[PDB]
Amino acid sequence: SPTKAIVRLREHINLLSKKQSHLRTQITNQENEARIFLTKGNKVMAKNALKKKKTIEQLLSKVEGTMESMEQQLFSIESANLNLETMRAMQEGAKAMKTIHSGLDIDKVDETMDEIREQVELG
């Protein structure tokens, strides 16, 4: 069911979201270590810290990408659902109007009967 899917996608995004914040935190921490090392020490350590930071960034980009794909799917479903609603309503409105086209124009008992009568008589 569509409702089931929407819930899964939303919950899934939530999880990815939790991960995104964690990843962001790691990125800042690593950058900070790089800053202090540049002071209380050797570059090499700083360079190493930055490289780590980059790989944490690339992983984040992927987390973000999965989220982006998921978000797109939600939009496509939410959009599709609306269209269905439009179609049903449009379908419903046609039925209502049909009952109207009937009205008393078709509810002409004499016209119908005579027609039936002639065919009987016609044999």
Residue numbers in the entry: 18 to 140
Which lines from the publication concern this structure?
The endosomal sorting complexes required for transport (ESCRTs) are membrane remodeling machinery that mediate diverse fundamental cellular processes, including the biogenesis of multivesicular body (MVB) during receptor down-regulation, enveloped virus budding, cytokinesis, plasma membrane repair, nuclear pore complex assembly, and nuclear envelope reformation. ESCRT-III is a unique protein complex in that it is metastable and conformationally dynamic, forming hetero-oligomeric filaments of multiple subunits on membranes. Vps20 nucleates the homo-oligomerization of the most abundant ESCRT-III subunit, Snf7, which then recruits Vps24 and Vps2.
When we superimposed our Snf7 structure with available ESCRT-III structures, we were surprised to note that Snf7core does not fold into four α-helices, but instead, it contains only three α-helices that pack into a highly elongated structure. Although the α1/2 hairpin is relatively unchanged, α3 and α4 undergo large-scale structural rearrangements from the proposed autoinhibited ESCRT-III fold. α2 extends into a ~90 Å long α-helix combining the α2 and α3 segments that were distinct α-helices in previously defined ESCRT-III structures. Although both structures exhibit an open conformation, we noted two different orientations of α4 with respect to the α1/2 hairpin. In open conformation A, α4 extends in the protofilament plane, whereas in open conformation B, α4 is positioned perpendicular to the protofilament plane. Despite the large differences in α4 positioning, α4 makes a similar interaction with the α1/2 hairpin of a Snf7 protomer in a neighboring protofilament in both structures. The L121P mutant exhibited a MVB sorting efficiency of 32%, compared to that of the α1/2 loop residue Asn59 mutant N59P of 75%, suggesting that the α3/4 loop functions as an important flexible 'hinge' that may facilitate different architectural stages of Snf7 polymers.
